[PDB]
Amino acid sequence: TTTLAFRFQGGIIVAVDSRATAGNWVASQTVKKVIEINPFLLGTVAGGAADCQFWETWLGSQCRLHELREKERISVAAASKILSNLVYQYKGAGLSMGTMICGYTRKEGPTIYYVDSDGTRLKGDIFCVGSGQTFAYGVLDSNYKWDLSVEDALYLGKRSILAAAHRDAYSGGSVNLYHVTEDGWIYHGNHDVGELFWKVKEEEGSFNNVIG
């Protein structure tokens, strides 16, 4: 996997790939690695497919129970801590999860929390998680500014996944984009790397290492 999410002037961008592997066997090219917890909360998944899926699907149920009990949408901090406290109970049992809880609330504003299976929980502006995280970091960090437009930010997130999808053997398939604003998350489409790469190469003039 490669997943990222970064904070900026116009909210949060979230971008992920769609590949799933079993060793060198490419098992799927169409996996959904963004879990839609509610209209204002997103969760990225990287690591063990079942662990991530099962527990973040479970997280959504816990967040639903919160707003029933408290008559109020759960905070991004509280949501991420439910998940981090859960995986911490299973510490040593072998869970493999690299997730990012992204969302907006009134009291917090746009917020991103990195949560992993060995119990680490970190608030931050930029995170890249997965086997191809370093490849995404390289492109993202070198082009990141807080004052990016919504249009440019969406592209950078897409371009960063593409970069990792290209170099990392265990990342690829297609790019799923999301944009989180004060009004909630907005889906920005599925982008197959098969067409996206050549489209980006031609228009941007990049990827000169590849035989055109």
Binding site: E70, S75, A77, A78, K81, I82, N85, K107
Partner: protein, 240 residues
């Protein structure tokens, strides 16, 4: 384990053990809660048959559950300690998991839930205690005042009193408290609280306790002299 169902229904549809727990509350010393425009004040009676007391160390009637919420009560004193302890633990547990202090409504709901659980659990009797829970939610300036009772029902109050002769002081508050215009300042709110207790107490010496709670964890307990000034002022205006 002791299993006996002590709290049970009677032919007329009453749970006598819960109703007898209310009688214990009625026996207890009076407690009053009045909320103003920017504050809440918790007044408490202390019976004056006990002289030679040590007021430094004697358990205070108003207890802090967290830095922003307080709990006073009427009824069995020993029972109240168990509820307060549980509430204090839950307050810290909430900060730990939600990364945010409890709301006054949440803390009330928890305490009320504990009281209810003891009305249909085997081997236990209901708490002989009614509480007044007051404070301010995190990052909020709207005053909160709630009441609980042995049955487990809870509700919000603009102003409320519990304990012995509470029906007298409730009568006072019902005509003297205006919903459209609550006590605008701290002084006005404290005065109305002291006035209401003076209908019942006896003497305004070391019988009345007052605790003022303000937004952003600003809680302070008034001393004897400070309270006595309100008592002196009210009596002079009364003679008219």
């Amino acid at each position: 384990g002791y299993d006996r169902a002590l709290s049970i229904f009677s032919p007329d549809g009453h749970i006598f053990q819960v109703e007898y727990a209310l009688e214990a509350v009625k026996r207890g010393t009076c407690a009053v809660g009045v909320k103003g425009k920017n504050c809440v004040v918790l007044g408490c009676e202390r019976r004056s048959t006990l002289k030679l007391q040590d007021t430094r160390i004697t358990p205070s009637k108003v207890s802090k559950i967290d830095s922003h919420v307080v709990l006073s009560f009427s009824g069995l004193n020993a029972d109240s300690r168990i509820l307060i302890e549980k509430a204090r633990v839950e307050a810290q547990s909430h900060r730990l998991t939600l990364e945010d202090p409890v709301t006054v409504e949440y803390l009330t709901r928890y305490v009320a839930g504990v009281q209810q659980r003891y009305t249909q659990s085997g081997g236990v009797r209901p708490f002989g205690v009614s509480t007044l829970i007051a404070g301010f939610d995190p990052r909020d300036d709207e005053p909160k005042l709630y009441q609980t009772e042995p049955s487990g029902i809870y509700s919000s109050w603009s102003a409320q009193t519990i304990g012995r002769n509470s029906k007298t002081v409730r009568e006072f508050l019902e005509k003297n408290y205006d919903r459209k215009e609550p006590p605008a300042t701290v002084e006005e709110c404290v005065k109305l609280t002291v006035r209401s207790l003076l209908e019942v107490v006896q003497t305004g010496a070391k019988n009345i306790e007052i605790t003022v709670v303000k937004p952003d964890s600003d809680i302070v307990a008034l001393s004897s002299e400070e309270i006595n000034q309100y008592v002196t002022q009210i009596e002079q205006e009364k003679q008219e």
